[PDB]
Amino acid sequence: IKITPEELERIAGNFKNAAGEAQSQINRLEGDINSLEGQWAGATQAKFRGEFIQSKQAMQQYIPILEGISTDLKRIADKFRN
Amino acid sequence: MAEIKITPEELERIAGNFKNAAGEAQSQINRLEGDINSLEGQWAGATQAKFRGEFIQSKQAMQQYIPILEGISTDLKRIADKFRNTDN
């Protein structure tokens, strides 16, 4: 083993932070989609809401994977240190 | 304050937000892959394989997400164009 617990924790932080940024991104984009509601036809809005929900579903897979990686790294760092 | 009315400029602004988001997402997955790569050889191969496998799962989700954002951007731009060409 060449890696230090501190380095594993740094990379774990990168994964946690990426997961947070991804959630923030989709939140901002959701605001944009929300802003269009009622400003054009319901059928048009429904199409964009549908597409946007597909993007949310992808992110609902992505985020827990990143958090899992982050936590797995921290678990190993703890094991190495102690 | 009033609700902001849709115009081609508004649709293009939002289309740009989606396109920018796709690029930021690409940058993120590239950075994280670099992190996973940086661990190669720093510990047992079996451990590296586990993290590579999990990372590949995240990359696959990301490879669905990015084109969906790009599709939204394209669709918004298409409507912006239609608005511009039917008004002027």
Alpha-carbon distance B58 to A63, whole Å?
A: 8
DSSP strands (E only) in B1-88: none
The Cα-based distances of B83 to B52, B73, B86 in angstroms read 47, 15, 5
Alpha-carbon distance A63 to B38, whole Å?
A: 21
Spell out the domains of chain A, with CATH numbers in brackets: 1-82 (1.10.287.850)
Query: Is-contact B70 B26, C-beta < 8 A?
Result: no
* C-alpha closest to that of A15 among B48, B45, B43, B58: B58
Q: DSSP secondary structure string, B52-65?
A: HHHHHHHHHHHHHH
Closest residue on chain B to A50 (Cα): B72
Alpha-carbon distance A46 to B82, whole Å?
A: 19
User: For chain A, which residues lie within 8 Å of any Cβ of chain B, measuring from their own Cβ?
Assistant: 1-3, 11, 14-15, 18, 21-22, 25, 28-29, 32, 35-36, 38-40, 44, 47-48, 51-52, 54-55, 58-59, 61-62, 65-66, 68-69, 72-73, 76
Alpha-carbon distance A3 to B47, whole Å?
A: 12
Tell me what percent of chain A is helix, strand and coil, each rounded to the nearest 5.
Answer: 90, 0, 10
What do you get for the CA distance between the two ends of chain A, in Å? 14
- SS3 call for A2: coil
Alpha-carbon distance A14 to B28, whole Å?
A: 10
* C-alpha closest to that of A30 among B43, B72, B38, B64: B72
What is the number of residues in chain B? 88
User: For chain B, which residues lie within 8 Å of any Cβ of chain A, measuring from their own Cβ?
Assistant: 3-6, 14, 17-18, 21, 24-25, 28, 31-32, 35, 38-39, 41-44, 47, 50-51, 54-55, 57-58, 61-62, 64-65, 68-69, 71-72, 75-76, 79
